[PDB]
Design a protein around this ligand. Structure first.
Ligand SMILES: CN[C@@H]1[C@@H](O)[C@@H](O[C@@H]2[C@@H](O)[C@H](O[C@H]3O[C@H](CN)CC[C@H]3N)[C@@H](N)C[C@H]2N)OC[C@]1(C)O
Ligand SMILES: [Zn+2]
Length: 259
């Protein structure tokens, strides 16, 4: 890399429309700016383009969780976990952006933002009555921006809706009446590598639009299409996302013992 094209706002809008983003809808965005860059206006230019594509009637949504099990969450100050990217960390600090008030936070901006983020602490994080399920309920679109289905949180929601038989102990920390309270729960967590199987599943039914957004390979799928397709596979095999024991994956092995 050396003298690469720095996409302007109008071009990014065109790439988003050409990919299938429709005005006035709900759009959940997972992004890796390292794949998107360089843009003319940096990470902020990507957010501005996403919102200009959705128009004033649409709602931009992004993950916003802190990734910290032992610290309480503050929607006004808690940084997002570094694994979510700089765009998610910057998005929630912008004006009029709403954020959920629990460590498994999402952020949203638009006429439907508070229908998406105004739920209390969900257990498990991606259960119903959580932001990722509200996006599914609101029939929104999911856009992966330089990341694969290993970052498609909607697939973890599909795992729960299938009542998948694995669940490992996890915990977070909240502030109740001024004292730090830890909250233990069971999460359907593994290595997430085999989430990539959704590529072939969704493409075989022609449910995944692909194209460039900036410099990144972008995948655009409906939330209902992600859940329905994943449920169809989990209905054939609930352990489809876990590595076989021969693979030696520690985390998937831990999920297998939890059954
Ligand atoms: C906030 N609680 C979290 C807990 O929810 C969990 O979150 C997992 C995360 O650890 C996994 O991370 C796993 O996969 C990563 C790459 N995708 C690499 C690291 C691996 N442990 C994610 N794949 C799925 C999350 N829901 O990670 C442990 C934790 C920090 O206690
Ligand atoms: Zn694994």
């Amino acid at each position: 890399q050396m003298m690469q094209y720095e996409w302007r706002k109008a071009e990014l809008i065109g790439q988003l429309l050409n990919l299938g983003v429709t005005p006035g809808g709900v759009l959940l965005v997972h992004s890796s700016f390292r794949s998107v860059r360089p843009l003319e206006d940096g990470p902020l230019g990507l957010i501005e383009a996403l919102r200009a594509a959705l128009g004033p009637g649409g709602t931009l949504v992004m993950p916003s969780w802190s990734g910290l099990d032992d610290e309480p969450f503050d929607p006004a100050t808690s940084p997002v976990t570094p694994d979510l990217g700089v765009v998610s960390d910057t998005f929630w600090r912008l004006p009029n952006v709403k954020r959920s008030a629990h460590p498994f936070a999402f952020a949203a901006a638009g006429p439907q933002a508070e229908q998406i983020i105004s739920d209390p602490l969900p257990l498990p994080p991606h259960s119903p009555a959580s932001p990722v399920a509200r996006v599914h309920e609101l029939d929104g679109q999911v856009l992966l921006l330089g990341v694969g289905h290993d970052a498609n949180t909607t697939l973890a929601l599909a795992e729960l809706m299938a009542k998948v038989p694995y669940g490992v102990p996890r915990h977070c920390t909240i502030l109740q009446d001024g004292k730090l309270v830890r909250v233990d729960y069971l999460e359907n967590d593994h290595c997430c590598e085999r989430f990539a199987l959704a590529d072939r599943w969704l493409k075989e039914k022609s449910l995944q639009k692909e194209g460039p957004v900036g410099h990144a390979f972008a995948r655009l799928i409906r939330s209902r299409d992600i859940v329905a397709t994943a449920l169809g596979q989990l209905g054939r095999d609930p352990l489809i996302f876990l590595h076989p024991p021969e693979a030696g994956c520690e985390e998937c092995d831990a999920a297998r013992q939890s059954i």
